[PDB]
């Protein structure tokens, strides 16, 4: 009963591969020969945010492009001001190991999660003057890897038990679940219209899930190792994945295959965080060789080098207006490159 | 209008800086440990003598130790074990012994010892079930290892009296099997501390205390470029 199903799955994979080869007209590097290159990108460290003790593991920018959260593994979640370098808030955490954080699009709630398998949602409406644990979401059997807000009521979370979930903040129950992966779902990226979302796992595959329907639409397998990060293009029709084999890959949603492969001979370090710019020309990749690289997304040429950190760069964020780039590494230092 | 908001933000920043200085004085005094092992190792008696993660707060000679025990997780360890990179010690507890457990323990210790980000953290080894080794040697350690018969007893260590020679021979054979892959690519930045424990023993906390003291002393000698 297993041999016939495995051979049918192999025949369907061969049909998908033949369709992807038949739909492959021409590559992007052949048609981007007449494109003017970007050139040297000089980004300097304008601000340096030093208030953490342990390693900064994640961050997220606000909607007003002014405040930003930063979670560390000492038991701190500090809400920084990027303009006047002042600490707006500092939340002490219940569990000291926190692997992800999020900021609301309205600017009211802040979520966090880690090895305690509990998504803690804090409220920034200080009626009493002090922040308190507004909600706790506990329905996963693995570690919480990433979490993002759709609105003030719903939250998409990804866990280490090969499942993603859609939680309602008011009730506290899973609206829908997503079970199609075989490895740890490392990260997710919401669409700008908040209709679909991608999720990359440890089986070198990124799947495109629907929020309203709750089932997978497309699957993308083009890597050789664990996909650590993923990010959408600013229009919402392509995305880029960073993996552990020192290669970045830009996939397309419509063509159902990869468009670009970013690699180099000297780079033998895996990628931790990827993020586009506001327009979509520069692609930021944070490697493990203590510096970040600014690739040209249309010509696959490394334009810039952001080398100011000492330890592994774990989190990288671009604001909505594209004004600055916040990078946080394991030396407890946030840096505002511009 | 902006002056009052700037003064309020400066006062809030001063309060948060005072709170973070106090939290730093609390944080740098406590020493954190990672308890890791297999399923049949016997960590339940270890946590009874001394959710996703399990918290254990204790103190010896007014020195706070916080032990972190991994609970409701999966077998995929290659993503969250990078989170334990600033701990002072990984207490790796295995039992000497169905499938082969010692080879899986050796492969796990080889993967921890040769990790890219775990080159600075020291591993405190614990061999838990010694009474089971004494009971199973009478009527299976020679089947999984063909070099057990062609092995000499080390004379540089003092064994406990009133024991069979085969029991202590298997003890130091397992010890040398861990020290073969331990003393291969260590290069002085991180060390391993093998130990022998039993079920009912309250002398383990002093062993962890002395081993963490040795780790911090070797770290301070490394920072001065003396050792």
């Amino acid at each position: 009963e297993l041999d016939q199903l495995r051979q049918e799955a192999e025949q369907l994979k061969n049909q998908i591969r033949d369709a992807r080869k038949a739909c492959a007209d021409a590559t992007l590097s052949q048609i981007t020969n007449n494109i003017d290159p970007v050139g040297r990108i000089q980004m300097r460290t304008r601000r340096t945010l030093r208030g953490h003790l342990a390693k900064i593991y994640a961050m997220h920018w606000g909607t007003d492009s002014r405040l930003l959260v930063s979670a560390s593994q000492d038991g701190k979640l500090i809400i920084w001001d990027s303009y006047t370098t002042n600490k707006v808030h500092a939340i002490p955490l219940r569990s000291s190991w926190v692997m992800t954080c999020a900021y609301a699009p309205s600017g009211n709630y802040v979520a966090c999660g880690g090895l305690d398998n509990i998504c803690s949602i804090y409220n920034l409406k200080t009626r009493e003057g002090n922040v308190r644990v507004s909600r706790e979401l506990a329905g996963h059997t693995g570690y919480l890897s990433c979490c993002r807000f759709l609105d003030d009521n719903q939250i998409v979370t990804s866990s280490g038990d090969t499942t993603c979930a859609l939680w309602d903040i008011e009730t506290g129950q899973q609206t829908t679940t997503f079970t199609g992966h075989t490895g740890d779902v490392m990260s997710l990226s919401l669409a700008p219209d908040t209709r679909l979302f991608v999720s990359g796992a440890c089986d070198a595959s990124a799947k495109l899930w629907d929020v309203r329907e709750g089932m997978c639409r497309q699957t993308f397998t083009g890597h050789e190792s664990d996909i650590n990060a993923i990010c959408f293009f600013p229009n919402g029709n392509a995305f880029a994945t960073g993996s552990d084999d020192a290669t970045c890959r830009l996939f397309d949603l419509r063509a159902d295959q990869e468009l670009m492969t970013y690699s180099h001979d000297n780079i033998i370090c895996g990628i931790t965080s990827v993020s586009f710019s506001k327009s979509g020309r520069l692609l930021l990749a944070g490697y493990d060789d203590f510096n970040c690289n600014v690739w040209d997304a249309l010509k696959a040429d490394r334009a810039g080098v952001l080398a100011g950190h000492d330890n592994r760069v774990s989190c990288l964020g671009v604001t909505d207006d594209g004004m600055a780039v916040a990078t946080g590494s394991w030396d407890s230092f946030l840096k505002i490159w511009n | 209008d902006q002056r009052n908001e700037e003064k309020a933000q400066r006062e809030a920043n001063k309060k948060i800086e005072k709170q973070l200085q106090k939290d730093k004085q609390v944080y740098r005094a406590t020493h954190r440990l990672l308890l890791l092992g297999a399923g049949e190792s016997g960590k339940s008696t270890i946590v009874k003598q001394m959710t996703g993660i399990f918290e254990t707060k204790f103190q010896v000679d007014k020195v706070n130790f916080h032990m972190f025990d991994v609970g409701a997780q999966r077998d995929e360890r290659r993503k969250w074990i990078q989170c334990f990179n600033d701990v002072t010690a990984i207490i790796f507890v295995v039992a000497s012994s169905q499938t082969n457990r010692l080879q899986e323990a050796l492969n796990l210790f080889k993967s921890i010892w040769n990790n890219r980000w775990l080159r600075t953290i020291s591993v405190i080894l614990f061999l838990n079930k010694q009474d089971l080794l004494a009971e199973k040697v009478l009527a299976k350690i020679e089947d999984y290892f063909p070099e057990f018969a062609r092995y000499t007893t080390p004379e540089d260590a003092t064994p406990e009296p009133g024991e069979d020679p085969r029991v202590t021979r298997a003890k130091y054979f397992i010890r040398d099997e861990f020290l073969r892959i331990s003393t291969a690519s260590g290069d002085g930045r991180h060390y391993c501390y093998p130990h022998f424990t039993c079920s009912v023993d309250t002398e383990n906390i002093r062993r962890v205390f002395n081993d963490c003291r040795d780790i911090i002393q070797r770290m301070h000698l490394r920072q001065y470029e003396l050792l």
Partner: nanobody, 126 residues
Framework: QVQLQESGGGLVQPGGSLRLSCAAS????????MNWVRQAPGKGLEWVSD????????SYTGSVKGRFTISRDNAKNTLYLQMNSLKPEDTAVYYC?????????????????????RGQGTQVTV
């Protein structure tokens, strides 16, 4: 797409020899240290052997020492395992597995329940 295909097996006589082949496709073969891991019926998975990237560091389990030969061909893009002088205990499902990270020595999740970087395996009954 990462795909690993096993070949060889079948019911043979005890004490004979056999040769397993593992064909890899979808990645660079010369960057990853590879493993052979078996799973007995009614028991869990157990690690058999491994070969490194260049082929210098070759290690075995003690129960299979001196009776197994693991080799690799980077140009031919394949992994061979020669097994002479078998025993009736070796009847298992064998897998050729790939370590998840390149240019490294550590291999964490090779002997696990749900690992995606290994093939469907082959049945060897002695």
């Amino acid at each position: 797409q990462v795909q690993l295909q096993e070949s060889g097996g079948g019911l043979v006589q005890p004490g004979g020899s056999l040769r397993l082949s593992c064909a890899a496709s979808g990645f660079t073969f010369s960057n990853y240290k590879m493993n052979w891991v078996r799973q007995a019926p009614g028991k869990g998975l157990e690690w058999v052997s491994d070969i490194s990237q260049s082929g210098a560091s070759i290690s075995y389990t003690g129960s299979v020492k001196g009776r197994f030969t693991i080799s690799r061909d980077n140009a031919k893009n394949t992994l061979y395992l020669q097994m002479n002088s078998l025993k009736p205990e070796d009847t298992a499902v064998y897998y050729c597995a790939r370590c998840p990270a390149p240019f490294t020595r550590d291999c964490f999740d090779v002997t696990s329940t749900t690992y995606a970087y290994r093939g469907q395996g082959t049945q060897v009954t002695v």
